[PDB]
Amino acid sequence: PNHTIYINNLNEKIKKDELKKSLHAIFSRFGQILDILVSRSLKMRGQAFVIFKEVSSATNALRSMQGFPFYDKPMRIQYAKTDSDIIAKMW
């Protein structure tokens, strides 16, 4: 368990700004969000990071929204571990 959730299987047709705003719309109820990180760098498409202020908020977000159909795609959620090299391992 960690402050930050890592989301993938996001609909890649969605623009960065709208994707962040729609992510706030469904995740804000879990607790205070410090930021949402979205990259349109090709290998980082389809993915997002939601940084909660509290770990309890991130845990409830991950369990409640696992598989949630969003832009017609079920999102996959995991905890982001610091220094896990998500980007460096990704191709």
From Swiss-Prot:
Consequence the record notes for mutating residue 9 to V: Substantially reduces RNA binding
Gene Ontology MF annotations: DNA binding; identical protein binding; RNA binding; U1 snRNA binding; U1 snRNP binding
RRM domain: residues covered: 3-82
Major location (coarse): nucleus
Superkingdom per UniProt: Eukaryota
Transferase listed as a keyword: no
Positions where N6-acetyllysine occurs in the chain: 53
Subcellular location: Nucleus
Keyword RNA-binding: yes
GO cellular component, one term: U1 snRNP
Any one Gene Ontology BP term: mRNA splicing, via spliceosome
Subunit text: U1 snRNP is composed of the 7 core Sm proteins SNRPB, SNRPD1, SNRPD2, SNRPD3, SNRPE, SNRPF and SNRPG that assemble in a heptameric protein ring on the Sm site of the small nuclear RNA to form the core snRNP, and at least three U1 snRNP-specific proteins SNRNP70/U1-70K, SNRPA/U1-A and SNRPC/U1-C. Interacts with SFPQ; component of a snRNP-free complex with SFPQ. Interacts with IVNS1ABP (via BACK domain); the interaction is indirect.
Functional note: Component of the spliceosomal U1 snRNP, which is essential for recognition of the pre-mRNA 5' splice-site and the subsequent assembly of the spliceosome. U1 snRNP is the first snRNP to interact with pre-mRNA. This interaction is required for the subsequent binding of U2 snRNP and the U4/U6/U5 tri-snRNP. SNRPA binds stem loop II of U1 snRNA. In a snRNP-free form (SF-A) may be involved in coupled pre-mRNA splicing and polyadenylation process. May bind preferentially to the 5'-UGCAC-3' motif on RNAs.
Family (UniProt): Belongs to the RRM U1 A/B'' family.
Protein name: U1 small nuclear ribonucleoprotein A
Natural source organism: Homo sapiens (Human)
Organism ancestry: Eukaryota, Metazoa, Chordata, Craniata, Vertebrata
Residues represented out of the complete protein: 8 to 98 of 282
